[PDB]
Amino acid sequence: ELGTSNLNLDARNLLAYKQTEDLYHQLLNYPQEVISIMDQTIKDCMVSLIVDLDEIETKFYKVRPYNVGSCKGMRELNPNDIDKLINLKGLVLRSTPVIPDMKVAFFKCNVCDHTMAVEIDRGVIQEPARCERIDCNEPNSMSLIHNRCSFADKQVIKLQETPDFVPDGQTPHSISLCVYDELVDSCRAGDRIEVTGTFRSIPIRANSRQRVLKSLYKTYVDVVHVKKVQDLAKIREVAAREDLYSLLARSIAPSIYELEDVKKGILLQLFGGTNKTFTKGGRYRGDINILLCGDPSTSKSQILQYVHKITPRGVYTSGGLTAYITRDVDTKQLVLESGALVLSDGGVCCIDEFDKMSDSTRSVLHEVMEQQTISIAKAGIITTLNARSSILASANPIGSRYNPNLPVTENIDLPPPLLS
Amino acid sequence: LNHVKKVDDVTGEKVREAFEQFLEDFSVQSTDTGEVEKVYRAQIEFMKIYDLNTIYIDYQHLSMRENGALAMAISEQYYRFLPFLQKGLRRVVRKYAPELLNERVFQISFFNLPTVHRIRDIRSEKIGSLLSISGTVTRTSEVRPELYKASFTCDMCRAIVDNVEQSFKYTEPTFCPNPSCENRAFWTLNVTRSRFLDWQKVRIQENANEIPTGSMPRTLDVILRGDSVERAKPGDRCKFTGVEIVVPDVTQLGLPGVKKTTEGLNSGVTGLRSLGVRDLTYKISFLACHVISIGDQEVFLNSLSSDEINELKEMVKDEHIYDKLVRSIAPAVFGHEAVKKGILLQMLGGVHKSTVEGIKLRGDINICVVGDPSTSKSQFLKYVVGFAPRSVYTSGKASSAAGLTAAVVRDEEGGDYTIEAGALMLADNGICCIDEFDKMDISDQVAIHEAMEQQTISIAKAGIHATLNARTSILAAANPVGGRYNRKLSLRGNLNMTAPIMSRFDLFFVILDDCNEKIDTELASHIVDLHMKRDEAIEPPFSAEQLRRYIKYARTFKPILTKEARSYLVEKYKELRKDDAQGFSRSSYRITVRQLESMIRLSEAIARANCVDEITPSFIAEAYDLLRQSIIRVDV
DNA sequence: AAAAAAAAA
Numbered sequence A: 001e002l003g004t005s006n007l008n009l010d011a012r013n014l015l016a017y018k019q020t021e022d023l024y025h026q027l028l029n030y031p032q033e034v035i036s037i038m039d040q041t042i043k044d045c046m047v048s049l050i051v052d053l054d055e056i057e058t059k060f061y062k063v064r065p066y067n068v069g070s071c072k073g074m075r076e077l078n079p080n081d082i083d084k085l086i087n088l089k090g091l092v093l094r095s096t097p098v099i100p101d102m103k104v105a106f107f108k109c110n111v112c113d114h115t116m117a118v119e120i121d122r123g124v125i126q127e128p129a130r131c132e133r134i135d136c137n138e139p140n141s142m143s144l145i146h147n148r149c150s151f152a153d154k155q156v157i158k159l160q161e162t163p164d165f166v167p168d169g170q171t172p173h174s175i176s177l178c179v180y181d182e183l184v185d186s187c188r189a190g191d192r193i194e195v196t197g198t199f200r201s202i203p204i205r206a207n208s209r210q211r212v213l214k215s216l217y218k219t220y221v222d223v224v225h226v227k228k229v230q231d232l233a234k235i236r237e238v239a240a241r242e243d244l245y246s247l248l249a250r251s252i253a254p255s256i257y258e259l260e261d262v263k264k265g266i267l268l269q270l271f272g273g274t275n276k277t278f279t280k281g282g283r284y285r286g287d288i289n290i291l292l293c294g295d296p297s298t299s300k301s302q303i304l305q306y307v308h309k310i311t312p313r314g315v316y317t318s319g320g321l322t323a324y325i326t327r328d329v330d331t332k333q334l335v336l337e338s339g340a341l342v343l344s345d346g347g348v349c350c351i352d353e354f355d356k357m358s359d360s361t362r363s364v365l366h367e368v369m370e371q372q373t374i375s376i377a378k379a380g381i382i383t384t385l386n387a388r389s390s391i392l393a394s395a396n397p398i399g400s401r402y403n404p405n406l407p408v409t410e411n412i413d414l415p416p417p418l419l420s
Numbered sequence B: 001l002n003h004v005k006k007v008d009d010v011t012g013e014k015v016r017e018a019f020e021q022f023l024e025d026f027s028v029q030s031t032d033t034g035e036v037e038k039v040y041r042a043q044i045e046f047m048k049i050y051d052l053n054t055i056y057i058d059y060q061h062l063s064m065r066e067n068g069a070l071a072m073a074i075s076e077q078y079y080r081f082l083p084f085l086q087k088g089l090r091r092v093v094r095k096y097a098p099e100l101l102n103e104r105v106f107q108i109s110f111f112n113l114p115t116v117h118r119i120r121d122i123r124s125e126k127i128g129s130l131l132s133i134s135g136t137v138t139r140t141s142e143v144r145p146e147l148y149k150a151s152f153t154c155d156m157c158r159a160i161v162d163n164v165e166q167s168f169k170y171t172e173p174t175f176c177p178n179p180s181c182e183n184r185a186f187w188t189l190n191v192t193r194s195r196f197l198d199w200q201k202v203r204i205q206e207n208a209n210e211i212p213t214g215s216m217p218r219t220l221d222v223i224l225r226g227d228s229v230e231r232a233k234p235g236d237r238c239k240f241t242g243v244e245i246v247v248p249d250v251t252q253l254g255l256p257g258v259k260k261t262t263e264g265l266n267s268g269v270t271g272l273r274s275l276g277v278r279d280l281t282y283k284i285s286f287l288a289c290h291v292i293s294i295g296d297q298e299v300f301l302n303s304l305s306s307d308e309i310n311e312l313k314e315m316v317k318d319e320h321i322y323d324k325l326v327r328s329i330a331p332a333v334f335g336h337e338a339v340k341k342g343i344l345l346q347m348l349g350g351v352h353k354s355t356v357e358g359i360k361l362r363g364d365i366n367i368c369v370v371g372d373p374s375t376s377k378s379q380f381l382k383y384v385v386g387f388a389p390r391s392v393y394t395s396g397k398a399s400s401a402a403g404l405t406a407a408v409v410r411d412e413e414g415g416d417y418t419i420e421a422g423a424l425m426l427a428d429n430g431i432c433c434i435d436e437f438d439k440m441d442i443s444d445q446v447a448i449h450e451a452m453e454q455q456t457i458s459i460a461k462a463g464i465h466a467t468l469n470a471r472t473s474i475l476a477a478a479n480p481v482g483g484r485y486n487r488k489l490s491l492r493g494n495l496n497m498t499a500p501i502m503s504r505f506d507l508f509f510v511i512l513d514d515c516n517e518k519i520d521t522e523l524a525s526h527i528v529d530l531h532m533k534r535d536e537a538i539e540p541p542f543s544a545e546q547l548r549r550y551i552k553y554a555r556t557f558k559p560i561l562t563k564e565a566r567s568y569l570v571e572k573y574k575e576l577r578k579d580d581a582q583g584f585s586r587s588s589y590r591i592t593v594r595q596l597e598s599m600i601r602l603s604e605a606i607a608r609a610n611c612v613d614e615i616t617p618s619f620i621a622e623a624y625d626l627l628r629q630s631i632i633r634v635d636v
Numbered sequence C: 001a002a003a004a005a006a007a008a009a
């Protein structure tokens, strides 16, 4: 009734049956053949159960087995476990662009403009030495066409072990990963995932000019499974409560004692104002910016962390924050990277230790609040970027205490206009 | 020998037939008066009368022709059916305009696609299919010629073999038609017989909008060809329309020349004749055919239209243009009439003249605005940035090393030795809007008064010397020392700027705030009304488009001076020099020849505003009044 | 990888 093509399959339920545990063990030994015959069986089972036959002949069927065995780490991988199913947990380090993979060749007899399709296997292609048309039958008239073939999307993922496997301050190890089709782009940088797949080994070409091969084989894992690590009616019931303001203000900071007014202000600025861009006058700022000052005995960083994690979008930084052209590390190319302030579009940008802000970056803030659009002109790139972000900062007075007699300006050491 | 007839791809012939059919007889109607347009026939007429080579086809106009039996058939297998479309286009053109062929590379660009894809959604199943993508261009390359159709000479018999189609490698022929010869030797390329085409490679990446979290942006390589070169400048967000292709590694392929990444595991393919024992890899690249971006008075009169004639004639023939004109500048702000008039005069500008021996005369107006905090001084800056073309907004303290004028940057042990352009350099032929003038530093503080008067910037550092053009019209704002303007003192006493900088400016405006109960209520009411009630319903006498039309019409006039104008001007200059020098010695020095030149420039600008080729001494009197009230203010 | 010269903070 859905039209999709996807099956989930747990091993423990597969293990609960006495005949199936034999199939369990045989799946452990021979993954590829078992998976292929299982997919063929499901392809037959669809038709066996529907007894529209038109949507079936277009789609394929695949399984996604999981929980076959306990998760193993890169620190214990014997060569005895080659071509067997294992489960891994780890953190994604880096991804790669989609790699086209040859599946069907397309040749053409240039003399007679005749084309034929040739299948391949194991990557190696058996080139035909003569055109099939015996009317011409020339041997050297066959030429490959690159852009009229069929391809598959291969992608390589780099994975690192979880830090819990290193008890004595050793360094983590990295294992390469491979994915196909629906598994492409399913993980990004910093993602914590668990995968299920078979093990593999491959020879190294060494010198590309000759046919010499190294005595050591590189190891990589091919996977078939990944996992990560009407409510509006309830809103209006709460929205009709008279004292919702006080409860909502006090809910943000459960451990903070008193300080009710600042909590109300922070909640209200989290709510945010309106934004309008009428043509004849120009846009008006809708962001709210708040500054906190006091001696370092107020737990004012706890409120910063509270607002950072509560808000949908927001970056928590300290005293670089904007876009700058960078030289890519692993690949020798030039990439434009956006800063922390740009990343907080529509959210709350949290700044800690605002006094030690240097001098070059402060003017940047003087540019980002009054116009909410930062421009850059470096390396031949001239452009303007939108920020539209809210600022919430904390500052400390100069000295062990803030003397009430002295006015605020001297103690914080900030420019009068920026405070204004 | 056998001469076997080639296979006829009838599908290509059928799609070509349908293509030429809806090319010849589209026959769409645009408006009521446009009964039959024949838009593509008119396009061919345009190529006749202007010698053009590219044609533009709308996808929507193609969409309703034969439904998906033709539109989808072309879009999906675009590479498959491209030569058939080329043949059909050549057939119809040589049916309707043989002399246009004088044999030439016709190009077709499809536009207005239903949807656009993100870079992260690019997948291999769409190879050879028409597509549209968007991103930020970050780098381009030089416009290099590209071999398209090569002609070859068989050296031992000097026979001619031509029309050899090329591929991703430089290909020589494989046979010689001469019966006595058998092409044992290779060929010599005939450069003067081959035909080349333009080629430029650009790089694009995902916008900051699409990219999630802190991951790195995805990059792609786009190749342009034909008339679409230099159309995507770095830093611009653009939309590309073209066909997905794939490029192999030519290094493994046979060539006359000599031959993250270390982990390998690439999809290598081996087993061919020419590869030997080498493996072939591939990479995704995009081919583009259409690029668009989403981010003399007689010449002006040539752009003729009913509104162009009527509106401009009405504006010229009116009697109270000036009275209305100043009322139409920055309708959002409240009050400050003279600041509006001054900004209008700055935006008109003055005539630029050069002497007979090569001495340049400054032809621009510089204006400074001084006032106590919060009296709506940055609003004028923002409005003039948003209205005046080629304008740049800049803060007084610049975070970059370029600062205001320029700077020299070199790579560590790198042979760059290149300059970077400051805001003044970018603002060429435009208006530079610096804010918070007070806290400039010494280098900029001494470079500005050379950039202003002489309109050039000169530098000589670390083996590179240059003289950059900085023809700009500056407008600046500042705040008095101590926060509030002290009426007791003068401009020099309150401001911290140096005396030479003050002489550079041509006009000054001082605006103050007060605690009067009658003014602040009106100010608050006007702010509230624009905020909620009439956020779009302001009442300016003239619209922005009319303002721009009149400004561009008035900019095409160069006023002159008459005898009475010269006599009145010299009398006024003598009076202004005399009366100020009567005050005190060694304490008042503010009038130089620059003031006379400023009078001339302001009179020329006022004459331009009224669209008069001559100058009346009333304009001189008005300019003198402005410059004198610039000194009335410093007294009060 | 390590020494030495130049512009900007």
Ligand SMILES: Nc1ncnc2c1ncn2[C@@H]1O[C@H](COP(=O)(O)OP(=O)(O)O)[C@@H](O)[C@H]1O
Binding pocket: A255, A256, A257, A295, A296, A297, A298, A299, A300, A301, A302, A396
């Ligand atoms: N009212 C309070 N309630 C709970 N904890 C507090 C309170 N005041 C101070 N603290 C404790 O004292 C510390 C104050 O540190 P803080 O001033 O936030 O450092 P910073 O210099 O980063 O602002 C907090 O870590 C908090 O645990």
Ligand SMILES: Nc1ncnc2c1ncn2[C@@H]1O[C@H](COP(=O)(O)OP(=O)(O)O)[C@@H](O)[C@H]1O
Binding pocket: B332, B333, B334, B373, B374, B375, B376, B377, B378, B379, B523, B527
């Ligand atoms: N129509 C108006 N009349 C008077 N003041 C205005 C008007 N519109 C905006 N303003 C105020 O003028 C200020 C413009 O900033 P600016 O004049 O540079 O003062 P500051 O130097 O303190 O930023 C804005 O903060 C705004 O509140």
Ligand SMILES: [Zn+2]
Binding pocket: A109, A111, A112, A113, A114, A131, A132, A133, A136, A137, A138, A141
């Ligand atoms: Zn053949």
Ligand SMILES: [Zn+2]
Binding pocket: B154, B155, B156, B157, B158, B159, B176, B178, B181, B182, B183
């Ligand atoms: Zn020959």
